[PDB]
Amino acid sequence: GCVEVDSETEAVYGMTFKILCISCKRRSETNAETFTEWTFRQKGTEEFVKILRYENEVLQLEEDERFEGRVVWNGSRGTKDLQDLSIFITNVTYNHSGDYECHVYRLLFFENYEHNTSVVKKIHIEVVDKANRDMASIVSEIMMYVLIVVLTIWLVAEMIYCYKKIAAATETA
Amino acid sequence: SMEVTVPATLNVLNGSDARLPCTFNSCYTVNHKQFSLNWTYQECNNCSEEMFLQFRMKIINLKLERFQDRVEFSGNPSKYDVSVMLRNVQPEDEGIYNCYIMNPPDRHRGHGKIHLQVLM
Amino acid sequence: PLRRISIKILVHSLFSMLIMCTILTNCIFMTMNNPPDWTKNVEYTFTGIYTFESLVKILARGFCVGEFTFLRDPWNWLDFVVIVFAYLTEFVNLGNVSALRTFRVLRALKTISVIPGLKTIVGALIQSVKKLSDVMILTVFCLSVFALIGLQLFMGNLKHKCFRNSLENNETLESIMNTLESEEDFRKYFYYLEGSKDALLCGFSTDSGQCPEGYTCVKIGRNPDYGYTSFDTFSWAFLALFRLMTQDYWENLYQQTLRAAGKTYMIFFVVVIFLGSFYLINLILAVVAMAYKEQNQANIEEAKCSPYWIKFKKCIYFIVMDPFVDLAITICIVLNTLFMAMEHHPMTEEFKNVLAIGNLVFTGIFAAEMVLKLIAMDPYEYFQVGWNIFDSLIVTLSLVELFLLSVLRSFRLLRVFKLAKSWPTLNMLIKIIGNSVGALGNLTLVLAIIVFIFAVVGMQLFGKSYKECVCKINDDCTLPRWHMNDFFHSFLIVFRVLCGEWIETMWDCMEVAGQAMCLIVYMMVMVIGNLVVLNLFLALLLSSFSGKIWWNIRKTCYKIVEHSWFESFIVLMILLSSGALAFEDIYIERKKTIKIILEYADKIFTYIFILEMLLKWIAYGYKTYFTNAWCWLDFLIVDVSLVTLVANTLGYSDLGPIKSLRTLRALRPLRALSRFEGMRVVVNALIGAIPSIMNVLLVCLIFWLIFSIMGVNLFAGKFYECINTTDGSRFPASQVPNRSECFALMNVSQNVRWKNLKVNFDNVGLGYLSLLQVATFKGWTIIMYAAVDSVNVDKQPKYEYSLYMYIYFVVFIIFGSFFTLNLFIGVIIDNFNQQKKKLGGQDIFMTEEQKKYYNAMKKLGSKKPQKPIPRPGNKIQGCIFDLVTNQAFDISIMVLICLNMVTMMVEKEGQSQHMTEVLYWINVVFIILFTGECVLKLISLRHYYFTVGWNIFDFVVVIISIVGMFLADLIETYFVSPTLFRVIRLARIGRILRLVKGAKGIRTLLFALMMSLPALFNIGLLLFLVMFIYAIFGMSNFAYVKKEDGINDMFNFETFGNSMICLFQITTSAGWDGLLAPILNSKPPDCDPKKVHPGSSVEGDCGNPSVGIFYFVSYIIISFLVVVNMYIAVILENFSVATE
């Protein structure tokens, strides 16, 4: 079912990027209605400006030019109880850099209880000219070869010590 | 018939307090909206019944003129108890006292009958 | 003179028969349940005959001498009482009329005396109980200790319920509680999980939980199950544990405690089920079986024109060609059966017609043959043969419906039996069945008599209550499916209890009939009823049973593989390689970093294994390498991994089956089997027995096939019903009687669905599946409700229209489960016996090193006397010492411990502060007295005291008790951990364990378990690995399935911790049907084929019906095979210890 996964923090310039905000209900069985707001403040700036609101089935995106015309919704479709809210940007640009705050509003229907809740997820993204391999990924690759070389080296060294001893035994009898 | 335990005859001295004790027993657990208890008095066997106390959500004491303010509820119905108390009994209190208990979901209605006699 | 006549009357052939005939007739009457008024006179007649029989016995025997001859025999006392109650009943009687009838029930008992040999059989069963006494104390002690541990650890836990956070009117939790008692009322306030009886259980810890947002967790109110399921009091805890020991609905208790307590407590259940249930039950079987052998064997040892018509006769008898014709017929019959096997809920007319024609040819072939046999052998000669008598009825029945009831046909399936003579096993199944009504007929008859008495007794006692209360166990105020109102129904409940299903029914008997009565009756049926069943099973089973530089290089590699570091290094890789498997789950996406290292890590592993394999080839060569079973296993695994790597590495590839090949990766833990000596040994034992196991499976399939075929004819296509989708409630049938009618409703109504069961009798394969659930007793009841309810193929099911169909299930259980299991158990244990004989009479479950250790433990058995010790020179030593060696001192201490144990029992949830302080102080005195005893033994004994093993345990317990005490105190002043505090107080249960030293009987039983620990460990290791491979297969395959029944948050396949929890439950085979239910549904509207699954790439939650069925079924069978092993290991050790 639903799992919460943090969004990627590095985006390549001039390429599409997907921002992930996933919020999971404590109990899957319960049914509630959700809506979301995403507000972004450009890097080196203070405060926040709401960029988009998604309620019901239609998505409403703020009119400002920085985010105008290059955003798409990757959230849950037709559920009306979204769970997963994600925003996809086409033609990523330098202007799209900074702190992104996404707030979720959920109406939970219980037997005689109606509950309204708010959860906030914050994602910070910095654009970059060329994508770079993560430290864990690069280090792991380098680390893997060293291990392979040592074992191979260990086996060869092992055979060499073993071979001389075996050969010597043959000579005596 | 419903299991209702009362003394068939209750003999009480004039001026003493008379507890009219009846036991009602049925399966399930009593419900306040559900449990209803009614008490009636008759001066004689064939005489018209006069309701003097009811349980409907709570105790309702009808304050019949014939009893003044001498009737009191004296039982915890949740215990299957629906007894009443007649304080400072007078000779005119002699007669027949009926307890009727209808308890949902039990369809059956219990009935206890006490013949109260007043000594001298 | 009169005495002679009476005496003459007393011993007569007819009189015993006359007394007996009347008694059997009376039994039919008891079954009335509201007999007509006219029957009363009949009642009078029965009373008179009893008195008349009694008078002759009393008149002749007594000689007016005080009836010395008459009352001397024990059996007559029962007889004397029955007549009297009737006289007494007429005479002023006690108030309880319902109670009054039960006494008359004993008349039925009188039957034991009247039948020949029943008196002998019952006495033997009772003789059996005397042996069982010691195990009983241990069960009580064992159940008692666990009850104490359970109570301390889980008291008040079942109380948790989600409670709403915001309340109108300033109400408080306490204020709300007194005000509401209504069921609807309880619901608004607390969560309540969608139509369930009680509020959802919540938890404080991160592992357990959880309550929906807007609801908070607080503990208040009654425990679930009417308050019956709780750990609050010692008595209640004892009932909960007893249920766990017999494993009745244990799956539910485990699920409930785990949810409230948190998953970490799963450990408590593993130890209790593993030691408390598997072990305790086994002990009972060994003792009953062991006891039966002595008595059975001990008793056995003491004993030791006209001529022309005849001309035709030469031809036929010459034409029978017994070499070809009889042999030809069996082959022909098997073929007909296969023809019968072809059926479905929906069949086109053309297919149906072929069945009609195929049946006729078969009808024609057998019929020609039947006439032929009699002419050749004539009627007297022909009819005499037993099989022939059997066949003519078969021919006769076929002919009768040749052109003329549905029920009549269903019998055609039986013919298939003739195959038994040729087959060796078929012979075994038939032989076992014969004993039940043959030599063991008297014993089997007792079981029938006992079941009858209980059904009637239950009916008399609780029959009236069920009808009046109803509402105390239903909403429609109508009778539940299982009830005690009628004899057939009362009988069904008793039958269910014979299978281990008592708790579900018992809660209900209690709601209507009260706790004291319901508990006593059910407990007796279970103990007494089961003992008879156990005796029959065991009795039946036992009786039935009896340059050339290349050469140097090749030598060197051999050196490397043989070397210990390498063997050791390889094993580490296997454990490490297997472990990486656990990390992949639905949550792998979070923690992206671990995912990257794991992906890279596998490549290093693939290279190491491929490298290792090459060394194997050079060292062993191809011929040696491929003639080994293990190597082939190793080679196959590296290859699958290798193909994925090249395909992944080669690139391009990654479509369809290539992905499927990857799932086989779960198979990796398998290499590990060769490496561990303990694990490998268990496998040797299994391979040895697969051929033997194989013959039986075929017999069962043949036996089951008849039942499955029979089942298909009766219920195929009749399980469909129109149900309201919102609450899944079948419509009345007053409206929507047939499928055609149901569809019209859908057109004008949104949520009505016409739907099948999912496990049913639509086809022979499905019938095979439905039958398996019924045999196991898991998930069976859902099916039976369907079978009885059913009316016709396209018609809506009426409620209990069939009613008697239950007979079909009852017969299958007796034959399908009781007999085959008897056969399954008999062959497997025997095969194990042969294996032991072959390997020089040594146990087959232990590694050589384990064997040396096992012998050392054997030494502990010896009682050679240890040195007495010397009374010190000093008087104080003499005085202090003189008291300790006294017999009274041990008894006084022993009594003291029992007194201590009773104190622990008094603790209960909600005890007042005053009670808590006294218990604390009372314990301190014991803490002081016990510490005091230890010091005293030490002053007198000195170094000698440390010599005894028991003294050391006693000394250690005191240190733990005092230390546990300080720690509890220390925690209070500086910390506030409730969970931590409960665990610390657990230290005291240690003193209770000292009770064991005093009882020699229990000590021997406990010691035996210790002996089998080495064998049990190996099986446990093997079992763990199999569970592990399955968990991995499950995580990839079943995560994402829709959550329905048995699958919900927790107890789901989403992660490795979760998968392990489920697999453990299913090991006992419990609730296996429940897990399988979500996997089965495929396609709308059962499930949505493409689902978003936020946070992940995969689409759909549809179970694979084919893959799912193989997985659950295979696991059930495999676990069962290993469990047979525990049964075998425990029995062997038990015989040896008792034997000494």
Ligand SMILES: *[C@@H]1O[C@H](CO)[C@@H](O[C@@H]2O[C@H](CO)[C@@H](O)[C@H](O)[C@H]2NC(C)=O)[C@H](O)[C@H]1NC(C)=O
């Ligand atoms: C199927 O069952 C549902 C669930 O009870 C029925 O729905 C109820 O219908 C009545 C009257 O239409 C409403 O007053 C209730 O509120 C409904 N329950 C809820 C909670 O929705 C429904 O009537 C049934 N379907 C049909 C066709 O009878």
Ligand SMILES: *[C@@H]1O[C@H](CO)[C@@H](O[C@@H]2O[C@H](CO)[C@@H](O)[C@H](O)[C@H]2NC(C)=O)[C@H](O)[C@H]1NC(C)=O
């Ligand atoms: C299936 O059930 C329907 C419903 O009763 C039967 O069809 C008719 O039902 C209507 C009510 O709409 C009655 O007026 C008719 O009398 C019913 N049929 C007849 C011939 O009386 C139908 O017969 C049932 N059997 C089927 C359709 O196989």
Ligand SMILES: NC1=N[C@H](O)[C@H]2[C@H]3O[C@]4(O)O[C@@H]([C@@H](O)[C@@]2(N1)[C@@H]4O)[C@]3(O)CO
């Ligand atoms: N001792 C039991 N083991 C089964 O796992 C249980 C499941 O199956 C069954 O048929 O009905 C329910 C319960 O009563 C069972 N009882 C019955 O067997 C069940 O929870 C869902 O069906």
Ligand SMILES: *[C@@H]1O[C@H](CO)[C@@H](O)[C@H](O)[C@H]1NC(C)=O
């Ligand atoms: C993401 O947005 C694109 C619009 O370009 C849409 O086609 C796609 O379906 C979205 N992703 C998901 C998972 O819905």
Ligand SMILES: *[C@@H]1O[C@H](CO)[C@@H](O)[C@H](O)[C@H]1NC(C)=O
């Ligand atoms: C990205 O945006 C630029 C405008 O700066 C536009 O010219 C270009 O076409 C966009 N990229 C694609 C692939 O359309």
Ligand SMILES: *[C@@H]1O[C@H](CO)[C@@H](O)[C@H](O)[C@H]1NC(C)=O
């Ligand atoms: C990009 O950002 C700069 C400053 O943040 C702004 O002046 C410019 O107008 C933006 N580009 C577009 C196309 O609006």
Ligand SMILES: *[C@@H]1O[C@H](CO)[C@@H](O)[C@H](O)[C@H]1NC(C)=O
């Ligand atoms: C709760 O629902 C109301 C609708 O009455 C809405 O106005 C409000 O914004 C919701 N709360 C939150 C935190 O979104």
Ligand SMILES: *[C@@H]1O[C@H](CO)[C@@H](O)[C@H](O)[C@H]1NC(C)=O
């Ligand atoms: C008063 O007693 C009568 C008995 O005649 C009973 O039917 C009625 O329900 C009682 N009244 C109430 C309010 O219960």
Ligand SMILES: *[C@@H]1O[C@H](CO)[C@@H](O)[C@H](O)[C@H]1NC(C)=O
């Ligand atoms: C809620 O508070 C008011 C004060 O205005 C008080 O009068 C009332 O009794 C409170 N409600 C309850 C249920 O006590």
Ligand SMILES: *[C@@H]1O[C@H](CO)[C@@H](O)[C@H](O)[C@H]1NC(C)=O
């Ligand atoms: C529903 O009724 C309509 C009549 O307008 C009919 O044409 C249609 O076939 C019906 N639906 C089904 C599934 O039979």
